[PDB]
Amino acid sequence: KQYSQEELKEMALVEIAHELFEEHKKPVPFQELLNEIASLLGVKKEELGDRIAQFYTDLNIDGRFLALSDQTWGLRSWY
Protein backbone atom coordinates (compact mmCIF):
# COMPACT_ATOMS: atom_id res chain seq x y z
CA LYS A 1 0.00 0.00 0.00
CA GLN A 2 0.98 3.60 0.90
CA TYR A 3 3.48 2.79 3.61
CA SER A 4 7.09 1.83 3.28
CA GLN A 5 8.41 -0.70 5.83
CA GLU A 6 10.28 2.16 7.45
CA GLU A 7 6.95 4.03 8.02
CA LEU A 8 5.27 0.84 9.33
CA LYS A 9 8.11 0.45 11.84
CA GLU A 10 7.17 3.91 13.10
CA MET A 11 3.46 3.00 13.48
CA ALA A 12 1.41 1.62 16.33
CA LEU A 13 0.70 -2.09 15.66
CA VAL A 14 -3.06 -1.16 15.94
CA GLU A 15 -2.84 1.20 12.99
CA ILE A 16 -1.12 -1.45 10.89
CA ALA A 17 -3.93 -3.85 11.92
CA HIS A 18 -6.51 -1.26 10.94
CA GLU A 19 -4.84 -0.99 7.50
CA LEU A 20 -4.85 -4.79 7.23
CA PHE A 21 -8.53 -5.03 8.08
CA GLU A 22 -9.35 -2.38 5.55
CA GLU A 23 -7.78 -4.50 2.74
CA HIS A 24 -8.87 -7.98 4.05
CA LYS A 25 -12.54 -7.04 4.61
CA LYS A 26 -12.89 -10.07 6.97
CA PRO A 27 -12.38 -10.92 10.73
CA VAL A 28 -8.84 -12.08 11.55
CA PRO A 29 -7.73 -13.90 14.66
CA PHE A 30 -5.05 -12.27 16.80
CA GLN A 31 -2.27 -14.78 16.05
CA GLU A 32 -2.80 -14.36 12.33
CA LEU A 33 -2.72 -10.56 12.60
CA LEU A 34 0.57 -10.91 14.49
CA ASN A 35 2.00 -13.09 11.73
CA GLU A 36 0.91 -10.69 9.01
CA ILE A 37 2.15 -7.59 10.89
CA ALA A 38 5.46 -9.38 11.70
CA SER A 39 5.97 -10.15 8.06
CA LEU A 40 5.36 -6.49 7.00
CA LEU A 41 7.85 -5.38 9.64
CA GLY A 42 10.50 -7.89 8.38
CA VAL A 43 10.41 -9.87 11.64
CA LYS A 44 8.93 -13.01 13.20
CA LYS A 45 6.03 -12.55 15.56
CA GLU A 46 7.99 -13.77 18.61
CA GLU A 47 10.31 -10.78 18.06
CA LEU A 48 7.44 -8.41 18.74
CA GLY A 49 7.14 -9.88 22.28
CA ASP A 50 7.34 -6.38 23.85
CA ARG A 51 4.54 -4.79 21.85
CA ILE A 52 1.83 -7.50 22.03
CA ALA A 53 0.22 -6.00 25.14
CA GLN A 54 0.10 -2.45 23.89
CA PHE A 55 -1.46 -3.90 20.74
CA TYR A 56 -4.12 -5.93 22.51
CA THR A 57 -4.94 -2.93 24.71
CA ASP A 58 -5.35 -0.69 21.84
CA LEU A 59 -7.72 -3.06 20.04
CA ASN A 60 -9.76 -3.11 23.24
CA ILE A 61 -9.78 0.70 23.78
CA ASP A 62 -10.32 1.84 20.22
CA GLY A 63 -13.89 1.66 19.14
CA ARG A 64 -12.95 0.96 15.61
CA PHE A 65 -12.52 -2.73 16.60
CA LEU A 66 -14.74 -5.53 17.85
CA ALA A 67 -13.70 -8.74 19.59
CA LEU A 68 -15.84 -11.33 17.79
CA SER A 69 -16.77 -14.78 19.05
CA ASP A 70 -15.50 -17.62 16.87
CA GLN A 71 -13.65 -20.78 17.87
CA THR A 72 -10.22 -21.57 16.57
CA TRP A 73 -9.56 -25.27 15.93
CA GLY A 74 -6.48 -27.26 15.19
CA LEU A 75 -5.06 -30.79 15.25
CA ARG A 76 -3.85 -32.39 18.53
CA SER A 77 -0.99 -34.01 16.63
CA TRP A 78 0.57 -30.49 16.16
CA TYR A 79 1.60 -29.85 19.78
For residue 14, the minimal CB distance to a second copy (Å) is 13
Angle between helices 30-40 and 13-24 (to 10 degrees): 100
Point out which span in 3-11, 37-45, 46-54, 57-65 binds a second copy (CB under 8 A).
57-65
The dihedral over CA atoms of 51, 57, 61, 64, expressed in degrees to the nearest 10, equals: 60
Contact flag: residue 21 with Ni ion (CB under 5 A): no
Amino acid at 54: Q
Residue 49's binding partner, choosing from a second copy, Ni ion, none, with beta-carbon cut-off 5 to 8 A by kind?
Answer: none
Q: Site residues (CB under 5 A) for Ni ion?
A: 60, 65
